């Protein structure tokens, strides 16, 4: 029964998930001045040409676009990563207003939303095993600002009416996640966690410097989703973001000067 309400939101999670107060929690504020350029970081390799999207699901906290991860079809390699990480799903976090919604912040700036492309390390065989390992996941985080529309997002926006409430799913084949990537793959990276319960400390975060732009109409459609099930009282799915957590004994590295 965790969520984003007054009574069950991020400040309460630690009671069921004590790792909430752990040493490598996410998100964090990215202080651009203090991040260190690491000239030995490699370019990211994003290989999404063979991606197979399957379905979109409202899970009561966000919506997930799920992929076939039973073969190396859509993978992330390079950068800070050793080995091959398969895309399993992406989802967003967003606000009730354009001035909030992201999980990571940049010099304390909040974006309207944040996209998370979630990948797991193939050496661990499946996602459930990967989340038990300190190098199990790689999450590509991309900020959204409101401005021009993102054409490559529109297919997602259009299906949202069919998954308004918790537990609803819809077929979602042939969606190309390359259409959600900014021009530049410059990034920050640090070791962290899932940003929802169970908050496991299994993620290498790769946060892109360059935001993508989406339109006010597109983000409005996100805000018409519901946290609740059909036939339950309507609560808009907004402000499904965890705030910045203490950096503790971590250094954020930059791939760029
Ligand atoms: Zn997320």
Swiss-Prot record:
Annotated effect of mutating residue 91 to Y: In OPTB3; partial loss of activity
Annotated consequence of substituting residue 198 to A: Normal CO(2) hydrase activity, but impaired stability
Cofactor(s) required, per the database record: Zn(2+); Co(2+)
Binding of Zn(2+), residues: 91, 93, 116
Residues the record lists as binding substrate: 195-196
Outcome after substituting residue 194 to A: Reduced CO(2) hydrase activity
Keywords: Acetylation, Cell membrane, Cytoplasm, Disease variant, Lyase, Membrane, Metal-binding, Osteopetrosis, Phosphoprotein, Zinc
Subcellular location field: Cytoplasm; Cell membrane
Gene Ontology CC annotations of this record: apical part of cell; cytoplasm; cytosol; extracellular exosome; myelin sheath; plasma membrane
Positions bearing Phosphoserine: 162, 169
SUPFAM superfamilies (UniProt xref): Carbonic anhydrase
Active site: 61 (proton donor/acceptor)
Mutagenesis or variant effect for residue 59 to A: Reduced activity
Gene Ontology molecular function: any one: carbonate dehydratase activity
GO term, biological process aspect, one: morphogenesis of an epithelium
Stretches assigned to coiled coil: none
Domain (Alpha-carbonic anhydrase) ranges: 1-256
Associated pathology: Osteopetrosis, autosomal recessive 3: A rare genetic disease characterized by abnormally dense bone, due to defective resorption of immature bone. Osteopetrosis occurs in two forms: a severe autosomal recessive form occurring in utero, infancy, or childhood, and a benign autosomal dominant form occurring in adolescence or adulthood. Recessive osteopetrosis commonly manifests in early infancy with macrocephaly, feeding difficulties, evolving blindness and deafness, bone marrow failure, severe anemia, and hepatosplenomegaly.
Function: Catalyzes the reversible hydration of carbon dioxide. Can also hydrate cyanamide to urea. Stimulates the chloride-bicarbonate exchange activity of SLC26A6. Essential for bone resorption and osteoclast differentiation. Involved in the regulation of fluid secretion into the anterior chamber of the eye. Contributes to intracellular pH regulation in the duodenal upper villous epithelium during proton-coupled peptide absorption.
UniProt-recorded name of the protein: Carbonic anhydrase 2
Organism for this UniProt entry: Homo sapiens (Human)
Lineage: Eukaryota, Metazoa, Chordata, Craniata, Vertebrata
